[PDB]
Amino acid sequence: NGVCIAYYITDGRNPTFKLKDIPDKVDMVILFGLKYWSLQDTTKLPGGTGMMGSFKSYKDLDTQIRSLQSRGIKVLQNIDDDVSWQSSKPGGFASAAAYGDAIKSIVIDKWKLDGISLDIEHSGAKPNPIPTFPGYAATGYNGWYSGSMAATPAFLNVISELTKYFGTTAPNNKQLQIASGIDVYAWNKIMENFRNNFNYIQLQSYGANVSRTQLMMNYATGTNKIPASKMVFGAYAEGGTNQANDVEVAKWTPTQGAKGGMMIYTYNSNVSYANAVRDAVKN
Numbered sequence: 040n041g042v043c044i045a046y047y048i049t050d051g052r053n054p055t056f057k058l059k060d061i062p063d064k065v066d067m068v069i070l071f072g073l074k075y076w077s078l079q080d081t082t083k084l085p086g087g088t089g090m091m092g093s094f095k096s097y098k099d100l101d102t103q104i105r106s107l108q109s110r111g112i113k114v115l116q117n118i119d120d121d122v123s124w125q126s127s128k129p130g131g132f133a134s135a136a137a138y139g140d141a142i143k144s145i146v147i148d149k150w151k152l153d154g155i156s157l158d159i160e161h162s163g164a165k166p167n168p169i170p171t172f173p174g175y176a177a178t179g180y181n182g183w184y185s186g187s188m189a190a191t192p193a194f195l196n197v198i199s200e201l202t203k204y205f206g207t208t209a210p211n212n213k214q215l216q217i218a219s220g221i222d223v224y225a226w227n228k229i230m231e232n233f234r235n236n237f238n239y240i241q242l243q244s245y246g247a248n249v250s251r252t253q254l255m256m257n258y259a260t261g262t263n264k265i266p267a268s269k270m271v272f273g274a275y276a277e278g279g280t281n282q283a284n285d286v287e288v289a290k291w292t293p294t295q296g297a298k299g300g301m302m303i304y305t306y307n308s309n310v311s312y313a314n315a316v317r318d319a320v321k322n
């Protein structure tokens with residue numbers, strides 16, 4: 040019985056399925072697409088358009104969020120890694136501490152959200168040297184996802200500062216999760232440093248079968264030393280074609296022990312698909 044984490048991309052797709060329509064047996068919802076800078080300054084992106092396409096206005100967004108929380112569903116904000124994380128001015132703030140405070144100020148202080156999930160896969164400087172990727176048998180991936188970036192010290196500082204307000208060691212029960220892949224350059228160093236801070240660690244194993252997820256599990260647990268109970272796999276509902284596999288992964292208990300659960304990308308892309316995955320990981 041794992042967790043069921045639902046991504047709700049706010050780009051207006053499948054509009055009749057409102058954020059508040061997230062069904063029961065869904066533990067958390069991660070607002071996705073919508074950027075934290077829109078939560079920060081609500082006047083820049085008109086409601087009902089772009090990444091606010093899913094809502095009539097910011098008030099509508101705010102109201103639906105509460106609708107989920109009052110039902111006990113945690114609502115997290117997606118935060119994407121960015122090349123500015125590798126600089127001394129992450130997010131254009133003065134330091135990683137400043138960046139961290141800002142995220143805390145916007146996501147928690149202002150929007151009273153339950154935490155954040157880090158989508159780690161964006162471009163930036165590659166590591167140097169680039170290590171030899173272990174390979175498929177060892178990780179479930181063929182090689183590096185060349186479009187990701189190195190977890191340089193500056194990049195690590197950002198996450199470190201964020202762990203002060205989000206995650207297992209932060210106060211006020213705030214979630215800190217990550218959605219990435221063993222193939223992203225920054226993976227290993229992120230886990231060497233913060234695996235224990237993450238409540239859940241999601242692998243974007245879109246389109247995988249149980250065999251491939253197990254391969255990932257072998258590495259995540261054996262080499263990255265991640266507790267099996269934090270591992271969450273990705274159900275690619277957006278694709279609409281891998282449900283049977285997703286359902287199997289959802290029901291599946293890795294050889295290393297009970298996993299954290301499943302995340303669904305995205306629940307609102309195909310509700311029936313998402314419900315099946317939810318049902319599978321829950322029952």
Ligand SMILES: CC(=O)N[C@@H]1[C@@H](O)[C@H](O[C@@H]2O[C@H](CO[C@H]3O[C@H](CO)[C@@H](O)[C@H](O)[C@@H]3O[C@@H]3O[C@H](CO)[C@@H](O[C@@H]4O[C@H](CO)[C@H](O)[C@H](O)[C@H]4O)[C@H](O)[C@H]3NC(C)=O)[C@@H](O)[C@H](O[C@H]3O[C@H](CO)[C@@H](O)[C@H](O)[C@@H]3O[C@@H]3O[C@H](CO)[C@@H](O[C@@H]4O[C@H](CO)[C@H](O)[C@H](O)[C@H]4O)[C@H](O)[C@H]3NC(C)=O)[C@@H]2O)[C@@H](CO)O[C@H]1O
Binds near residue numbers: 071072
């Ligand atoms: C966890 C995970 O799975 N990770 C990723 C997945 O995210 C990814 O799935 C796709 O995600 C896209 C969203 O990505 C953006 O948001 C996330 C979360 O914040 C970011 O991580 C990601 O990087 C994207 O954000 C980007 O941020 C950067 C900066 O932060 C922006 O760049 C800046 O831009 C400014 C300009 O202002 C300036 O130039 C700066 O210099 C520059 O840095 C960048 O703009 C921004 N990118 C975006 C997109 O905003 C989804 O969009 C994507 O969904 C589309 O594609 C999939 C294919 O996989 C389709 O299945 C799906 O149907 C969809 O198609 C689009 O659907 C929408 C839904 O409605 C349609 O919208 C309609 O559009 C109409 C006009 O065309 C009307 O407006 C209408 O009202 C509206 O509803 C749209 O028409 C469809 N068109 C497209 C694009 O096909 C998918 O979910 C996956 C797969 O790549 O990878 C995982 O690893």
